[PDB]
Amino acid sequence: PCFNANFNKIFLPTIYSIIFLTGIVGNGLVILVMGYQKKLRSMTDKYRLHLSVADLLFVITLPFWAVDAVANWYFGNFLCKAVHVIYTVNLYSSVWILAFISLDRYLAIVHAQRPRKLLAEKVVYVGVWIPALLLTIPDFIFANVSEADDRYICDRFYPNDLWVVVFQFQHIMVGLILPGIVILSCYCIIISKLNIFEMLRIDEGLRLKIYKDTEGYYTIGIGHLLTKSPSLNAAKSELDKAIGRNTNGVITKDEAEKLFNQDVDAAVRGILRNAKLKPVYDSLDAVRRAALINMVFQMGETGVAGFTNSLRMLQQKRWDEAAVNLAKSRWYNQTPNRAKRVITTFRTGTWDAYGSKGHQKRKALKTTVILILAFFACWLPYYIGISIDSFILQGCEFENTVHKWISITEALAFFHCCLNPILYAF
Amino acid sequence: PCFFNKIFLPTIYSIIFLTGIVGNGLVILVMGYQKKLRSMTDKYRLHLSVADLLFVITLPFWAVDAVANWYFGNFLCKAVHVIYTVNLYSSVWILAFISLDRYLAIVHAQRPRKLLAEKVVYVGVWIPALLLTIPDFIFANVSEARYICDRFYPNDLWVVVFQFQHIMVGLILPGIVILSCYCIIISKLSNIFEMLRIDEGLRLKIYKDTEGYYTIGIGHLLTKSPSLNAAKSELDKAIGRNTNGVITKDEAEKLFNQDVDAAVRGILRNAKLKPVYDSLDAVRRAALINMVFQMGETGVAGFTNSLRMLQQKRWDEAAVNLAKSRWYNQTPNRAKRVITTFRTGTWDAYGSKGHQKRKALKTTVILILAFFACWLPYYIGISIDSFILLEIIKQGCEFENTVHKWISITEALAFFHCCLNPILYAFL
Numbered sequence A: 001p002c003f004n005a006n007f008n009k010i011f012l013p014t015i016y017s018i019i020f021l022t023g024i025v026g027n028g029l030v031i032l033v034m035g036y037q038k039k040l041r042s043m044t045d046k047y048r049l050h051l052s053v054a055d056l057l058f059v060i061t062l063p064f065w066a067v068d069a070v071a072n073w074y075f076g077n078f079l080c081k082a083v084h085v086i087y088t089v090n091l092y093s094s095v096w097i098l099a100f101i102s103l104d105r106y107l108a109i110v111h112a113q114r115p116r117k118l119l120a121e122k123v124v125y126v127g128v129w130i131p132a133l134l135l136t137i138p139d140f141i142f143a144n145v146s147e148a149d150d151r152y153i154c155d156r157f158y159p160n161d162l163w164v165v166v167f168q169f170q171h172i173m174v175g176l177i178l179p180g181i182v183i184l185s186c187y188c189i190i191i192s193k194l195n196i197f198e199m200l201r202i203d204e205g206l207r208l209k210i211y212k213d214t215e216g217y218y219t220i221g222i223g224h225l226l227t228k229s230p231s232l233n234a235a236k237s238e239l240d241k242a243i244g245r246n247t248n249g250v251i252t253k254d255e256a257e258k259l260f261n262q263d264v265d266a267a268v269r270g271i272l273r274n275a276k277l278k279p280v281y282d283s284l285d286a287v288r289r290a291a292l293i294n295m296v297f298q299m300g301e302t303g304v305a306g307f308t309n310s311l312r313m314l315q316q317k318r319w320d321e322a323a324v325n326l327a328k329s330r331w332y333n334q335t336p337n338r339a340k341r342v343i344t345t346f347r348t349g350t351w352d353a354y355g356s357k358g359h360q361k362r363k364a365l366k367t368t369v370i371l372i373l374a375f376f377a378c379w380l381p382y383y384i385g386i387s388i389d390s391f392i393l394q395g396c397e398f399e400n401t402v403h404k405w406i407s408i409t410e411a412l413a414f415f416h417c418c419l420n421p422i423l424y425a426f
Numbered sequence B: 001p002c003f004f005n006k007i008f009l010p011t012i013y014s015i016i017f018l019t020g021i022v023g024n025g026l027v028i029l030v031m032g033y034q035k036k037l038r039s040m041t042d043k044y045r046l047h048l049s050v051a052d053l054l055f056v057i058t059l060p061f062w063a064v065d066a067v068a069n070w071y072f073g074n075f076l077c078k079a080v081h082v083i084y085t086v087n088l089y090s091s092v093w094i095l096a097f098i099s100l101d102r103y104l105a106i107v108h109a110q111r112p113r114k115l116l117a118e119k120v121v122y123v124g125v126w127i128p129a130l131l132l133t134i135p136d137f138i139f140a141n142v143s144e145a146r147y148i149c150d151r152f153y154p155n156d157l158w159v160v161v162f163q164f165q166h167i168m169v170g171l172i173l174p175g176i177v178i179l180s181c182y183c184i185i186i187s188k189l190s191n192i193f194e195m196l197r198i199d200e201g202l203r204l205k206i207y208k209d210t211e212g213y214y215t216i217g218i219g220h221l222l223t224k225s226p227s228l229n230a231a232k233s234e235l236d237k238a239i240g241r242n243t244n245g246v247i248t249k250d251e252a253e254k255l256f257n258q259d260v261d262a263a264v265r266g267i268l269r270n271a272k273l274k275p276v277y278d279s280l281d282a283v284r285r286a287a288l289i290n291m292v293f294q295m296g297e298t299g300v301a302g303f304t305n306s307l308r309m310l311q312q313k314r315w316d317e318a319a320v321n322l323a324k325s326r327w328y329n330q331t332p333n334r335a336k337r338v339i340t341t342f343r344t345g346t347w348d349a350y351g352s353k354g355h356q357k358r359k360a361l362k363t364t365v366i367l368i369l370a371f372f373a374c375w376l377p378y379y380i381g382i383s384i385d386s387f388i389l390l391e392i393i394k395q396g397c398e399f400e401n402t403v404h405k406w407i408s409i410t411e412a413l414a415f416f417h418c419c420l421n422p423i424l425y426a427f428l
């Protein structure tokens, strides 16, 4: 004995039908709106449509799940294998696409050359789509239609419990453990690496030890002067006066930033006194004010004041027009690498020319974190359900409620298909 | 329903013990105190040796058990089991890390190489290997009959769970890491061009040269323009497709070949340079073309005595004459290489930088290739017996016992993987 659920034959078909409509409309929109019209697309937005294709592929099989619940399984043997294969493919792909999104996001922040084009355009197939299909061979073989309880039951029939043990471990590892670690690794490094200081760290360079400037003068950090003396020990004492701790050579990056802020305060005060630069600076925004400071740090205030027409256009909010003027200048002729990045900051009013953290880029990353967590949040209650009864085998009274919740939680977990389209909305 | 190794296995255990202990002991004593020539591969090769020395030390217990009984008790039974598990997972993951190092060194020479060897090696390889040794602690116990030491699981389900974990973590997961690193290195591993890349430097992106014109690659001029509008125009036509200001090595070499052709045609029309050029060998002709890109045919033609010396094949005389010149005084690094190319007639001046990097690649290749060849007969053996557990082979107990006999011979013979790394230091 202990080899009947009234409520689950009204809950499950409603939940499947709901996810089916929301999935087919939601995702199908993603597929049509990006798939075709969209021309400026992100690396995340490329994986999000790859993910949308995967979630659409599964939602299409949902009508079969609803019929199999309320009534018999009429669809035959091939469709039993096909419905099992699509679910397998979806399970593996959806999570490992999220692994590629978190992996790409790592290379976007921590490594701002570009081996990301390889990932999104050619690795994604070899690494995600082909293995997901190869992982469907035991679902092609074992899934069959059988007569049980004056009905046709469609599931995977294994010859032994050792096979059940083989495939359950392969699913826990490949489906959840293996990408979960990859996903955690990327975000652990991202949050470890995580504005104006960073800009001048790239442009003027950072040195955490006393060096000889190009005109014979002792400096430390981003060209911060200590004293006016050709000796070595006289400048070493001047550091402790500002820093407040004994160093004897080596200084940290955060003590340096302290000296850098003292020089930015100085650059601002000087700009505010210079009659030509003062009105334009006040009209500019924090991002663009930081670009003007980059120039002032370079050739001085008199040099930046020399760009007459460029200044008025910046106040007149003409970024596109003031851009070509600085390319003809002596500043572009000398150092063209630094010059172009400063003009791009004036052009866009963003930290994009400097790459990684910035404003729009943080929001773009927050979007990626929400999606990944919400995906795990869907599957989480069901995992405890595998886990509780996954080890079982107290009594039949409690075992009836366990297997009941595993049906509900898997059905509610399918909301992960509706996550990506809902996230794009508003 | 199934109802020589007692002498042969301890012979293999003894051979692998003596070669292992001595070899790894030497690697630890020598490379442990060698601060001079320390190489990145040698840094992981010390971990691999420590992992293999810890295992070779437990082999006298393995030999004793096989012939006569387990005298060592319950504690040592767990210790020999854990060390075998530690050596099994770590040795391969060290080779997997060595494969990542070769990728990071060849694909792009940031510095994540020092972080892997000095700090990611413990958290990535040693900590997980000890975490994976926990089931072997709780399951290994000694039973009676004779005393038998092995892992005793409650049923066959536990046996299958760990057998799949061992196949996946021990073979599948690092095997992919190793193959992937290598198919990437082989991919991005495709003369005079590389000689001038070391000298002048390659640039895929558009750059103003020191003087105002627009240039791309290795000294390939386009035209005179006040803005980006006319620079890309001459580039896009010469390539044969849309560039958008970007090109690869395929296109850049095709531009370099044109500039070499113009230089060669220019050298041939010159009355001073042509007899010298024709007399010179392939490698030395490329050394002369190098001088033409730096100074110009007119400049190279100035070096009268030096040219006639090359024309007369008086190599050493021409090498000192070019070293005692303003060209050498101004650019010592480039000149010395070009001079030594004219002196030796070999690529050595340039392919003695990438000779220790190329040697490291081969050593790694042999070390990895030998490791899997050592485990290949054992993998074949287990695969056959894996299907015996899952019920495919139509054979009796005569063949079912023959495989278990051969699985033990191949396991003992696989241990030789502890001896590959030290033997490679002696031969290579």
Ligand SMILES: CC1(C)CN2C(CS/C(=N\C3CCCCC3)NC3CCCCC3)=CSC2=N1
Pocket: A064, A065, A068, A069, A083, A084, A087, A153, A154, A155, A407, A410
């Ligand atoms: C893990 C898995 C894919 C396996 N499975 C199962 C077992 S098959 C199955 N119906 C469907 C599951 C999904 C594929 C189509 C059959 N059985 C019963 C038969 C009695 C009446 C209720 C449903 C139910 S939900 C679930 N999820």
Ligand SMILES: CC1(C)CN2C(CS/C(=N\C3CCCCC3)NC3CCCCC3)=CSC2=N1
Pocket: B061, B062, B065, B066, B067, B080, B084, B148, B149, B150, B151, B408, B411
């Ligand atoms: C895979 C494994 C670690 C497991 N195993 C086995 C099975 S346990 C075992 N004792 C050895 C296991 C390995 C450590 C030393 C004892 N059996 C017998 C006991 C009677 C004499 C022959 C071996 C043989 S060789 C081997 N290697």
